[PDB]
Scaffold this active site. Structure first.
Site, PDB file in Angstrom:
ATOM      1  N   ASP A  57      -7.010  51.396  37.740  1.00  0.00           N
ATOM      2  CA  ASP A  57      -6.695  51.343  39.162  1.00  0.00           C
ATOM      3  C   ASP A  57      -5.692  52.404  39.595  1.00  0.00           C
ATOM      4  OD1 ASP A  57      -8.250  48.889  39.900  1.00  0.00           O
ATOM      5  OD2 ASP A  57      -6.880  47.962  38.458  1.00  0.00           O
TER       6      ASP A  57
ATOM      7  N   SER B 112      -2.662  55.698  43.353  1.00  0.00           N
ATOM      8  CA  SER B 112      -2.841  54.280  43.073  1.00  0.00           C
ATOM      9  C   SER B 112      -3.876  53.715  44.033  1.00  0.00           C
ATOM     10  CB  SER B 112      -1.521  53.517  43.209  1.00  0.00           C
ATOM     11  OG  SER B 112      -1.065  53.538  44.549  1.00  0.00           O
ATOM     12  N   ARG B 113      -4.863  53.002  43.488  1.00  0.00           N
ATOM     13  CA  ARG B 113      -5.963  52.504  44.308  1.00  0.00           C
ATOM     14  C   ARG B 113      -5.564  51.308  45.160  1.00  0.00           C
ATOM     15  NH1 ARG B 113      -8.191  55.388  40.295  1.00  0.00           N
ATOM     16  NH2 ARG B 113     -10.387  56.012  40.436  1.00  0.00           N
ATOM     17  N   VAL B 114      -4.604  50.502  44.701  1.00  0.00           N
ATOM     18  CA  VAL B 114      -4.215  49.309  45.448  1.00  0.00           C
ATOM     19  C   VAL B 114      -3.626  49.692  46.800  1.00  0.00           C
ATOM     20  CG1 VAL B 114      -2.579  47.402  45.494  1.00  0.00           C
ATOM     21  CG2 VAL B 114      -3.959  47.806  43.457  1.00  0.00           C
TER      22      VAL B 114
END
Ligand SMILES: Nc1ncnc2c1ncn2[C@@H]1O[C@H](COP(=O)(O)OP(=O)(O)OP(=O)(O)O)[C@@H](O)[C@H]1O
Ligand SMILES: [Mg+2]
Lengths: 116, 49, 150, 177, 69, 49, 57, 116
Positions: free
Chosen positions: C1, C26-28
């Site tokens: 992620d 960061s994908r979040v």
């Protein structure tokens, strides 16, 4: 994408912008090494136009809400065609660098211009 | 890698062409400068006399 | 992620954490961090990347304009204040205070060489006077108008 | 393997197709083994060995991009090469017969269009062709029947070109001798 | 066999100015087209393949050519 | 002063000649193109028949 | 009081020829451009309308 | 190609010719940009010698008669090396350019030059 089924203005604008970007990609290394001061007037004008165009293709989308607080924005086709024709004609060169980044519409561009 | 090598090759070729052109232009300008400089001798000699 | 790139050239350059902001992601997203942090800090990575690109492009440029010089100064300050040494624990309130101070142009006048030490000064002084501000954050996780004005 | 097994090649670069030339055919690498043994006499005469002209044109225009002071003959050669390159383009789905190709190449080689600004040559050329097809039919018959270009036909074509160019304008144009 | 062939001499038109101005093509000659992705090889092939309508319209088969794809 | 009024009549005459010749040529081209376009439409008509 | 009107006449004559020839050439090229533009516009409009009606039929 | 195999004069002539050709190739650039007028008297004379030698090197062939009607001919090595030793000083610079295309020895070429 051919003028047989599409208006010729679309074709002309696409060809012009593609040629400009190709020329900028060609002149990249000389600009990086010998600098902008070595080129002639035409090369400098095309470099500035390429920078303007390259910045202008950016656009914010609604899906970016989770990552950035900027809301969504959408623009129709004819407005984009006219804006690209204006930019490739070379009548918006007086604007600064940050005025052409993350711009949705022409009115938004003017509002950001008045904000600096 | 391979792509980096090709990129550097292209950049070096373009640089060589540009430098050769600039050198030839400067060599051309040398003759005009030499022609221009040697035109103030008579006035200087006469004013000194 | 999400991944973080670390380069040795940056490490020898002077950036002790030596993280490359150009590629790290960061994908979040911002949902993980507290709301106060996202209010104070936002879209900083774009600024850092554009600053690095402009420094690369105009490293030889004949002349600088007002906007170009202002951006160069701002990015220089922003990069300089981000350096952190080893074994230096830090809490969230101190981080948000420092980030707000950096991002609202209150350190533009100070020269680069004193950017770090000056910061390390101010964080000490607040620890004895007007400390209740920090307490408020620990009870609100956000900033108000009165606290920011004070 | 396939290059070594056959003869004659036509390289199709993508950089050329990106801007400018639509056919986008490379010239400095392409070759034909048969060559003149498979040509028409008239167009072979009209060809005038433009290969060397194009080669020295690109070689010089590499230098002359930043050069404003040049030899007059060098400038003339550069202009001729640019005009020929701009002429050689062609759209799609539009085949051409032999006689109009020969006429266009003859117009290009002799320097008749050297006074035409390079920005709007193609359209002008097209118009000429159309007019030549409308009010004239003898030259096509002659080139079809004898496969050779006669001097009298050349003089008539010169007169037609002069009278047509006298009355054509694109943008602040100027008809000249 | 090698004892059943002549020399090549014939104007095989192609309908393209650049091709027949630079690299001529005759009967019995194998010509190669090598290209990169999205360049326009098929367009040239189609133009050549349909250029022969007028040739077919003539009476005797001396000009007629029967093409296959 | 006497010579000053010689060219205008010739200018008007050639202007009228140009007008008539361009009208004739435009009419010829228009009628022709209409002719073959109609013929091609008819031809594809029996083609589809 | 008479020998300056003569130089005035000479000065006027020295420019009347050029002014007249320039005006004549300008009018000629204007009318030629107008005629050619009208003819080409008529041809293009006729071709476009013919193509449209051919497509309709 | 060694001095100890084909004689020292052969080696000297070869070295002189190579040097002259290299100098001509080097000065080609200034010839193109400024011409031979700016070249010094030594430079102009060496350029003329180089081009005359290049024209002289060519020799008519046997099969050439199928398009020019002139059969080829052979020359002994001694005559060729002596002729090139004589030409090294560039004495024939006053002879016409067209007369320098060889068909054989030096005597017939000199006679044809006098026959122009
Ligand atoms: N002369 C031309 N003028 C304008 N557009 C052209 C011309 N020739 C080709 N094109 C365009 O270029 C593209 C080429 O498509 P084409 O069908 O020829 O594919 P190709 O490049 O041969 O590749 P592939 O076979 O791999 O699909 C098309 O979009 C076509 O319209
Ligand atoms: Mg294809």
């Amino acid at each position: 994408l051919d003028p047989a089924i599409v208006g010729d203005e679309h074709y002309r604008v696409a060809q012009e912008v593609i040629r400009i970007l190709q020329r900028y990609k060609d002149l990249q290394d000389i600009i990086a090494i010998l600098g902008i001061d070595e080129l002639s007037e035409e090369d400098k004008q095309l470099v500035n136009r390429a920078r303007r165009i390259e910045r202008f293709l950016s656009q914010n989308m609604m899906a970016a809400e989770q990552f950035t607080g900027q809301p969504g924005s959408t623009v129709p086709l004819k407005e984009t065609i006219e804006a690209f024709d204006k930019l490739t004609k070379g009548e918006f060169d007086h604007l600064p660098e940050q005025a052409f980044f993350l711009i949705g519409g022409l009115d938004d561009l003017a509002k950001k211009a008045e904000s600096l | 890698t391979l792509r980096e090598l090709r990129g550097r090759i292209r950049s070096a070729g373009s640089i060589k062409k540009i430098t050769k052109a600039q050198e030839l232009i400067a060599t051309s300008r040398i003759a005009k400068a030499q022609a221009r400089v040697e035109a103030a001798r008579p006035y200087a000699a006469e004013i000194t006399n | 992620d999400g991944q973080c790139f670390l380069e040795s050239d940056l490490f020898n350059q002077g950036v002790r954490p030596a993280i490359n902001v150009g590629v790290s992601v960061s994908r979040v997203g911002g949902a993980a961090q507290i709301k106060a942090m996202k209010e104070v800090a936002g879209s900083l990575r774009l600024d850092l990347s554009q600053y690095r690109e402009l420094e690369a492009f105009a490293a030889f440029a004949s002349d600088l304009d007002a906007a170009s010089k202002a951006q160069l100064d701002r990015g220089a300050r922003l990069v300089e204040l981000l350096k952190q040494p080893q074994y230096s624990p830090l809490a969230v309130e101190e981080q948000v205070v420092a980030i707000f101070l950096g991002t609202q142009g209150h350190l533009d006048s100070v020269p680069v060489e004193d950017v770090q030490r000056f910061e390390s000064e101010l964080l000490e002084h607040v620890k004895a006077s007007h400390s209740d501000i920090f307490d408020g954050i620990r009870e609100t996780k956000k900033l108000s108008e009165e606290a920011e004005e004070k | 393997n396939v290059i070594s097994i056959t003869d004659g090649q036509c390289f199709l670069e993508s950089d050329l197709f990106n801007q400018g030339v639509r056919p986008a055919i490379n010239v400095g690498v392409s070759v034909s083994r048969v060559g003149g043994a498979a040509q028409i006499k008239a167009m072979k005469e009209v060809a005038g060995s433009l290969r060397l002209d194009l080669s020295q044109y690109r070689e010089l225009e590499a230098f002359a991009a930043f050069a404003s002071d040049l030899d007059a003959a060098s400038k003339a050669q550069l202009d001729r090469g640019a005009r020929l390159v701009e002429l050689l383009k062609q759209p799609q789905y539009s085949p051409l017969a032999v006689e109009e190709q020969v006429v266009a190449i003859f117009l290009g080689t002799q320097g008749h269009l050297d006074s035409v600004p390079v920005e709007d040559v193609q359209r002008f050329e097209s118009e000429l062709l159309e007019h030549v097809k409308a009010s004239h039919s003898d030259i096509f018959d002659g080139i079809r029947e004898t496969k050779k270009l006669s001097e009298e036909a050349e003089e008539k074509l010169v007169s037609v070109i002069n009278e047509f160019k006298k009355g054509f304008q694109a943008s602040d144009g100027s008809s000249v001798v | 066999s090698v004892v059943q062939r002549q020399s090549v001499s014939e104007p095989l038109q192609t309908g393209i100015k650049a091709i027949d101005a630079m690299t001529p093509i005759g009967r019995g000659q194998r010509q190669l087209i090598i290209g990169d992705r999205k360049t326009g090889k098929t367009a040239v092939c189609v133009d050549t393949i349909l250029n022969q309508r007028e040739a077919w319209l003539t009476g005797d088969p001396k000009q007629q050519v029967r093409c296959v794809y | 002063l006497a010579d000053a009024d010689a060219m205008h009549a010739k200018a008007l005459a050639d202007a009228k000649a140009e007008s008539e010749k361009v009208t004739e040529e435009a009419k010829q081209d228009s009628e022709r193109i209409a002719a073959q376009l109609s013929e091609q439409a008819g031809s594809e008509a029996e083609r589809i028949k | 009081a008479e020998r300056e009107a003569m130089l005035a006449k000479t000065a006027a004559d020295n420019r009347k020829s050029a002014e007249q020839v320039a005006a004549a050439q300008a009018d000629y090229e204007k009318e030629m451009a107008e005629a050619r533009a009208q003819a080409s516009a008529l041809r293009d409009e006729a071709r476009a309308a013919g193509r449209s009606v051919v497509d309709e039929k």
